[PDB]
Amino acid sequence: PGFVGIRFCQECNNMLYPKEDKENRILLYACRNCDYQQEADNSCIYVNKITHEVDELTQIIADVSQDPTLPRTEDHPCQKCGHKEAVFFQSHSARAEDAMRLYYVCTAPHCGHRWTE
Amino acid sequence: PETRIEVEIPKVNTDLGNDLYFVKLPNFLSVEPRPFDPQYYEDEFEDEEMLDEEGRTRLKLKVENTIRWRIRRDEEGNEIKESNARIVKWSDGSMSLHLGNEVFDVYKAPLQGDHNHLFIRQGTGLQGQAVFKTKLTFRPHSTDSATHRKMTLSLADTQKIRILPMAGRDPECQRTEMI
Amino acid sequence: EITPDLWQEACWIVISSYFDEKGLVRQQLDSFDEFIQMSVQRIVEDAPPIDLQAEAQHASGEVEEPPRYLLKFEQIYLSKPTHWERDGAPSPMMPNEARLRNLTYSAPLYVDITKTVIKEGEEQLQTQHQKTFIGKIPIMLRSTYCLLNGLTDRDLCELNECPLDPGGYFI
Amino acid sequence: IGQRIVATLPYIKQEVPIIIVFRALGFVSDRDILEHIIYDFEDPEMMEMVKPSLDEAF
Amino acid sequence: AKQDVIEVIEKAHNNELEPTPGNTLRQTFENQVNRILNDARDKTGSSAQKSLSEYNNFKSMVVSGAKGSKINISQVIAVVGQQNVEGKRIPFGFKHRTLPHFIKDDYGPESRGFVENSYLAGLTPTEFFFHAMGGREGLIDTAVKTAETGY
Amino acid sequence: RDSQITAIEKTFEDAQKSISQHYSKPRVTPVEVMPVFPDFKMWINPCAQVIFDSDPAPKDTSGAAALEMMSQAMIRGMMDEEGNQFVAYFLPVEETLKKRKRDQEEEMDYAPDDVYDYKIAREYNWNVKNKASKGYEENYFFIFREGDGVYYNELETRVRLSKRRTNALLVVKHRDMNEKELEAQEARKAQLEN
Amino acid sequence: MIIPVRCFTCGKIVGNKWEAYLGLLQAEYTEGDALDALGLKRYCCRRMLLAHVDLIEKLLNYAPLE
Amino acid sequence: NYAMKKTQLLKEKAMAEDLGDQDKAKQIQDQLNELEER
Amino acid sequence: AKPRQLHNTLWGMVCPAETPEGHAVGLVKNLALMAYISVGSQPSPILEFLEEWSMENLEEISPAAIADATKIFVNGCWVGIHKDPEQLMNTLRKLRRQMDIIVSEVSMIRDIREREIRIYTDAGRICRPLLIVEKQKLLLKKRHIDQLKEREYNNYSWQDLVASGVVEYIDTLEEETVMLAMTPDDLQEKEVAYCSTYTHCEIHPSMILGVCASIIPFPDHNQSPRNTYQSAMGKQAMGVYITNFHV
Amino acid sequence: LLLAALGRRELDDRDHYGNKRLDLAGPLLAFLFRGMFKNLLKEVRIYAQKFIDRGKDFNLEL
Ligand SMILES: [Zn+2]
Ligand SMILES: [Zn+2]
Ligand SMILES: [Zn+2]
């Protein structure tokens, strides 16, 4: 299925929208103002994850690794750098929050490796 | 690869002694590096305005609590240097700052957190001299004095308010000007 | 460092020092003093200077360029609490005097005003009226602008006042 | 079909679509507008969410 | 009780807990922890009851029915228990935690409001504040219902 | 005006008078009394205050020993890959420290034939502000000399260093100041009178 | 404000001992030792001096009515 | 008698309100006596 | 009900028991013993200090650069973005811990996961002083205490403690990014490390109680609503309200 | 707003004190004084207006 995102008109930088090639029966992207237009890359017009299957890793950030208010474990060495000290916390996202699943981040600078087990 | 930098520059020398203390004086205390002479004196011509009590508050602290030093020649012409401030160490390890006859507390604290260093610039470089290790913190004693009451305003250091001396018949001033 | 045995002593000694340092109404005293010291002046200059133009009488039979008067407020002054007897004779207004005489513990406010008149391109004569009297503002008790400011224990009771009063209220 | 964003501006007797507000501030292209909102264009999920407002101000 | 709660919390953290039909994992988790802590408070209270002599005066005022109940005896002698607001454990008032003294995502007993002391032992500041949070609700409801029932 | 100048003069005459009791806890006694004067030796030097965002101290030295190493460190301005200028921080080895300390025992400012070695430790972004720039705040330092007195200096220039994002060894050989360099100090020295 | 004349609970006169107690208080005596010296053993009597606050000392700060 | 405030207020007012330093000293002499005088 | 309810955010700032039980229940509150309210101060020293730091000023920065950078708000005014804000925060802390550029009231919040820096110098911010904890060890050593027991003679005080960077005023908004210990004498030892990353320690937890609430003996041994009623009843108790009551 | 809408961020709490400020005697009196002073200037305006429209001179002390 993939994931379509916003595209801006090279002419006016306004958002580009999909349009079908009524003749060749294909998908086009066109600016709603100027006739700026290009051929579409996804063949998918839209997607809506009802289950909210999500890569929590995208919203997790390594900067949290230095949060002093975060619990640390010497029990889980970093899978990347092997460092013993790692911070652990839950995925605060509605479906991830309902799942209460834990995320671990390395307490080592420039490593910041974040994983779930 | 080791980048080789060979350079010729004059050395600037500092006599750092045994102990080095960093000092930032609060707004009610100050220090003057020029030797104090009534002639060529700093143009501190504040009073001719016939100042209000906020102005006299700042003026009183500025005039009376500014630490100065001077070169004095004896009858033989030998130069004796006099300063109006001096620091005293006590048997219990405490310290105090003396500004003439008045006495102020001095508490010793080592400099935690701030990495403040003294360097001297020569051309494109800086030559290190020292890192500040301990600082001096001051607080006034002598609570019986009236000067302690007004110092509360000193933090006030666009226009700022003034205090008239409670003088004038103001009701009469109102009544008469409205005629 | 401080042992557990001395940490309890250290803890209440530190708190005692805080109560030596800051009283219980420090934020109020500070706010009123800041109101007097900064906000009141800020409010004074924050006003736009007045530009008034005389209504054309058209008495000249032509479209007149009426003379216009301009005013700008400058320096601000605040006296200490002053009580004027019925005769306007100024005397120090003590909080207890204001309390017994049902007076308002306030100090008169003065402001420097530059008056101005601008007659077209023809000469204009900007003039000034200094230390003009504005209303009287009540002072928050024990603020720096009070008369019982920094006053010692001997003085306050001599002023028939309580030395332990934190202040922070108006009369 | 839904989720248009409107700002309740002071003294404005009616709620105003925010994308118009960005053009009104002079950030006229949608790129500009999102540049002040969608700081990272790598967010398909958030980008898909502002479209109702972008349509209203298209 | 604390150990059992910790073990369940870890299983929950390990997501090993099965959601019952209709209910979710978080809902069954909340239920499990509340159940265990309630059981703990109730069991400890019961043990206190069984220990009270007939000259114990709280019990004398409970069996006469004049004033107090076995739950008050549990709270004074055995344990105060879980302190709830809106019927639920103390919420994460701060960002993902109940107090600045606890760490993020801490579902432990005292971390979520379970007062582990009895009133005779006195409450630690965290659980003291949690008991304060629990006690304020009754006063507010007391003040508004009089206005609803009179109408 | 003259009543205040006169009031100031009184403070100098009074300052030589001896002390006999503590301002509180009168039962205690005084160990040392020192007058405060500007360091007549140090004012001629173009002093700059360097403020780092975080701890620059070398990992192998702890406590009082660590500060000594940093106190004799040398810092130099560089131009990067993009041409933006930055600051390189170089630390002395123990042998450089010995040479610098040795010169104090031999009473020499520097040995004209000796060379002092410094290696770069970190790169920093730089901002230089001095008294001619608007809103500058005065920082001071006092040097305590037991049995002599207290000699102070003012920090006329403030340098703020923050971690930036060339492995360089700075080997420095010293020479005497020329007529223009002495004049460069004296132009700076002129802020001490009239 | 000023020392109570009698112990609230028992009736023992405690008004004639405050100055004596203050004399004892000049020294490093703990509040209990002064009572021991003054012979006040029942806690009903001891509570009287232990809890007293001599505010009348503050009341004297006010200007007098010649 | 209660005029210690009046004398103190008179001396305090004169010191800031009067351009001469002598007035504050003359009031200070009265002020030292004031401790006994009230 | 929320506006009357005792929110977690009130810890140490507002007394949790001292409130009127009538229609003003929960609406009318009373300050904790160590709660201080910022009188307010100008941001000007700080703004130039920020502009000279490694902050791309908002007026200067390219939108693309804002993604991996924290947004700095001063008195809520977004003024710029920073690429290594931890160094910024370290500097800002270091300054406040010396009461130099950053006056003692200012509160600087770094929202780590959110990538926001909110700096407030304005008035009305309720804050309280806290002990600083750099390691699992106190910044406050015996020399400070030895000086302070003699505070009756020498005036050693809070100014020296904060100027020395041993104590700091945390505001409720800043209290969300600090890890706070209750007592150093116990939260510096370990059995199994719970946190190992404390940033502050409570001076004394009993200071969360207010004026009327601070006369209560053994308040942790009472059901809190009773404490609330005493807190209220402490306002109706007769007594010597002032020394000049006869005047 | 989107973050909250996406659920990436929890909603703000109106009762969370981190979102609150207390108006002390300063802002309170300033809020009053601003209004009273600003309107006072209208009094001076109308008074001057009475004299200056007539081309006469307004005594500001009045
Ligand atoms: Zn286009
Ligand atoms: Zn790692
Ligand atoms: Zn008795």
Curated annotation (Swiss-Prot), chain A:
Zinc finger residue ranges, C4-type: 9-34
Subunit details: Component of the RNA polymerase II (Pol II) complex consisting of 12 subunits.
Chief localization: nucleus
Record-linked Pfam families: Zn_ribbon_RPB9, Zn_ribbon_TFIIS
Gene3D superfamilies: 2.20.25.10
Annotated positions binding Zn(2+) 1: 9, 12, 31, 34
InterPro entries: DNA-dir_RNA_pol-M_15_CS, Rpa12/Rpb9/Rpc10/TFS, Zn_ribbon_RPB9, Zn_ribbon_RPB9_C, Znf_TFIIS
Keyword Metal-binding found: yes
Gene Ontology molecular function: DNA-directed RNA polymerase activity; nucleic acid binding; zinc ion binding
Lineage, uppermost ranks: Eukaryota, Metazoa, Chordata, Craniata, Vertebrata
Protein family (similarity comment): Belongs to the archaeal RpoM/eukaryotic RPA12/RPB9/RPC11 RNA polymerase family.
This protein's name: DNA-directed RNA polymerase II subunit RPB9
Any single GO BP term: maintenance of transcriptional fidelity during transcription elongation by RNA polymerase II
Annotated organism of origin: Sus scrofa
Any one annotated GO CC term: RNA polymerase II, core complex
Residues bound to Zn(2+) 2: 78, 81, 106, 111
Zn-finger region bounds: TFIIS-type: 74-116
General function of this protein: DNA-dependent RNA polymerase catalyzes the transcription of DNA into RNA using the four ribonucleoside triphosphates as substrates. Component of RNA polymerase II which synthesizes mRNA precursors and many functional non-coding RNAs. Pol II is the central component of the basal RNA polymerase II transcription machinery. It is composed of mobile elements that move relative to each other. RPB9 is part of the upper jaw surrounding the central large cleft and thought to grab the incoming DNA template.
Gene encoding the protein: POLR2I
Compartment(s): Nucleus, Nucleolus
UniProtKB/Swiss-Prot annotation, chain B:
Subcellular location: Nucleus
Cystines in this chain: none
Tissue: Highly expressed in skeletal muscle and heart. Weakly expressed in placenta and liver.
Domain of life: Eukaryota
Family that this chain belongs to: Belongs to the LEO1 family.
Function of the protein: Component of the PAF1 complex (PAF1C) which has multiple functions during transcription by RNA polymerase II and is implicated in regulation of development and maintenance of embryonic stem cell pluripotency. PAF1C associates with RNA polymerase II through interaction with POLR2A CTD non-phosphorylated and 'Ser-2'- and 'Ser-5'-phosphorylated forms and is involved in transcriptional elongation, acting both independently and synergistically with TCEA1 and in cooperation with the DSIF complex and HTATSF1. PAF1C is required for transcription of Hox and Wnt target genes.
Quaternary structure (record): Component of the PAF1 complex, which consists of CDC73, PAF1, LEO1, CTR9, RTF1 and SKIC8. The PAF1 complex interacts with PHF5A. Interacts with TCEA1, SUPT5H and CTNNB1. Interacts with SETD5.
Protein name stated in the entry: RNA polymerase-associated protein LEO1
Organism this protein belongs to: Homo sapiens (Human)
Residue range from the parent sequence: 354 to 536 of 666
Curated annotation (Swiss-Prot), chain F:
Keyword Hydrolase tagged: no
Signal peptide positions on this chain: none
Region annotation (Interaction with PINT87aa) ranges: 1-129
Residues of the full protein shown: 172 to 373 of 531
Amino acid composition bias (Basic and acidic residues), ranges on this chain: 182-194
Top-level division of the source organism's lineage: Eukaryota
Compartment(s): Nucleus
Keyword Glycoprotein: no
Organism the protein comes from: Homo sapiens (Human)
Protein name (Swiss-Prot/TrEMBL): RNA polymerase II-associated factor 1 homolog
From Swiss-Prot, chain H:
Subcellular localization: Nucleus, Nucleoplasm
Assembly and oligomerization: Component of the PAF1 complex, which consists of CDC73, PAF1, LEO1, CTR9, RTF1 and SKIC8; the association of RTF1 appears to be less stable than that of other subunits. At least in HeLa cells a N-terminal shorter form of RTF1 is also found in the complex. The PAF1 complex interacts with PHF5A.
Species of provenance: Homo sapiens
Entry text on domains: The Plus3 domain mediates single-stranded DNA-binding.
Protein name: RNA polymerase-associated protein RTF1 homolog
UniProt function note: Component of the PAF1 complex (PAF1C) which has multiple functions during transcription by RNA polymerase II and is implicated in regulation of development and maintenance of embryonic stem cell pluripotency. PAF1C associates with RNA polymerase II through interaction with POLR2A CTD non-phosphorylated and 'Ser-2'- and 'Ser-5'-phosphorylated forms and is involved in transcriptional elongation, acting both independently and synergistically with TCEA1 and in cooperation with the DSIF complex and HTATSF1. PAF1C is required for transcription of Hox and Wnt target genes.
Lineage: Eukaryota, Metazoa, Chordata, Craniata, Vertebrata
